[PDB]
RNA sequence: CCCAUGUCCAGGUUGAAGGUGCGGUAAAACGCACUGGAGGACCGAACCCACGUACGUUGAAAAGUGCGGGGAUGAGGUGUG
């Protein structure tokens, strides 16, 4: 949702202007992915939506790889905040 | 054969489901351990049955004994009424 995405940007971002950043993107994608996994458990047959789920997941994984390359401290802080492995 | 009401099955073993935790995952299938303790499951006394063999065969016995044998928490054995 737009209000939830606003909250997530304001929380995880470095500024109120820095809408775009890896931590911001990943924080949005994780909530979207949780909603989609619940939707999939409720709608097991919607493979057409599971595809977009996997695409979002790959996007998040690539962002996380960029973070592991550039800033390992930022990476670990992010993952402690989010709860990912 | 059945009704009701009771009672008996030394000991040991294996280790189903379920559960928990750790991996693995985007989350799961899944895997690894532990727990748990199922079974007309296993080995084997009493208990029950009678596979073989020898002997007995005017028998110890109008159907047995010995040497081994099968089942042994179940569709079990047994008691009283
Ligand atoms: Mg048995
Ligand atoms: Mg036995
Ligand atoms: Mg008796
Ligand atoms: Mg006979």
């Amino acid at each position: 949702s737009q209000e939830r995405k606003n909250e997530i940007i304001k929380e995880y971002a470095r500024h109120e202007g820095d809408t775009g950043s890896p931590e911001v993107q990943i924080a949005v994608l994780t909530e979207d992915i949780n909603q989609l996994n619940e939707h999939a458990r409720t709608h097991k047959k919607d493979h057409h939506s599971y595809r977009g789920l996997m695409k979002k997941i790959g996007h998040r994984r690539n962002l996380l790889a960029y973070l592991r390359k550039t800033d390992i401290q930022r990476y670990r802080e992010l993952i402690q905040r989010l709860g990912l492995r």
Side-chain angles (χ1 to χ4, degrees):
Chain A
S1 67
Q2 296 296 109
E3 66 277 16
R4 182 66 63 82
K5 182 173 73 172
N6 293 320
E7 292 174 352
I8 290 165
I9 295 164
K10 292 180 184 184
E11 181 62 27
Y12 292 91
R14 295 181 178 279
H15 296 85
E16 62 184 0
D18 293 330
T19 61
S21 292
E23 60 272 15
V24 176
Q25 290 172 353
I26 296 161
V28 174
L29 290 172
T30 51
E31 293 291 326
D32 293 332
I33 287 161
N34 296 318
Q35 293 178 0
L36 289 173
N37 281 318
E38 294 179 353
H39 181 76
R41 293 182 189 182
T42 58
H43 297 87
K44 293 181 184 179
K45 185 60 66 66
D46 192 1
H47 303 285
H48 293 84
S49 67
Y50 182 77
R51 185 175 180 266
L53 174 57
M54 295 300 293
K55 190 175 178 179
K56 291 182 182 181
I57 290 164
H59 192 269
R60 185 180 66 187
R61 188 181 294 113
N62 290 319
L63 295 171
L64 291 166
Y66 182 69
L67 288 172
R68 187 182 295 110
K69 290 179 184 177
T70 302
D71 293 329
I72 298 163
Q73 185 65 44
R74 183 179 293 174
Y75 182 75
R76 292 179 182 175
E77 290 177 354
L78 180 62
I79 292 166
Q80 290 296 108
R81 290 180 71 186
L82 295 168
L84 277 71
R85 185 175 66 259

